[PDB]
Design a protein around this nucleic acid. Structure first.
Lengths: 94, 95
DNA sequence: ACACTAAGGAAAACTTAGTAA
DNA sequence: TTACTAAGTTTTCCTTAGTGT
């Protein structure tokens, strides 16, 4: 998991490390420590946990695993598109 | 990491589990077991390893962590596009 | 409040060994 | 060959407890 992506999206959601952990299912007495290790690169959440985090952060989970800033923005933008716009991007390269 | 993405990409690259592991720097005696566990969901590789797999598999790594099939397809296509065509999509992905 | 950290106990991965398909 | 697993160690994470910012 990329810590730049966690941080950025968390800031954009405008919440603390701890409240992110709490909203994602981590006990209040571990949330702050755990989310900080995640965000400072000390440990990695498992994939289940990153899914909960992403839901909480309102992003597609794969955004947290995308090193390419351009592809990352495409994923981000694709997240707010409707099936109309999403399909028209589908055949857009086809 | 999503086991189906790993499997589908490994089969599209046309190599076996063991060979993929060896090309990712896993000792040849650990590779078969280790890649099999990854692809059956017994165990999950770390992101550093996932990056090495993607490189072998000639894919963007985040493909392996995309549950949405339509986003995953978008990722693969973007993958194959050259630098110039990336501008075109980028321009459209804006505002 | 919020961010951050070492240290231990707990959990999950890696290596080994070997069996089918 | 290629796919796959149980076991025990290694490695990593999760919890605690608490400092700094």
């Amino acid at each position: 998991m990329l810590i730049r992506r966690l941080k950025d999206a968390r800031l954009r959601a405008g919440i603390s490390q701890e409240k992110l952990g709490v909203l994602a299912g981590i006990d209040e007495a571990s949330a702050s420590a755990r989310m900080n290790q995640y965000e400072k690169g000390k440990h990695a959440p498992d994939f289940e946990m990153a899914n909960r985090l992403a839901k909480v952060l309102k992003i597609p989970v794969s955004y947290l695993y995308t090193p390419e800033d351009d592809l990352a923005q495409i994923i981000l933008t694709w997240n707010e598109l409707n099936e109309q716009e999403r399909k028209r991007i589908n055949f857009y390269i086809r």
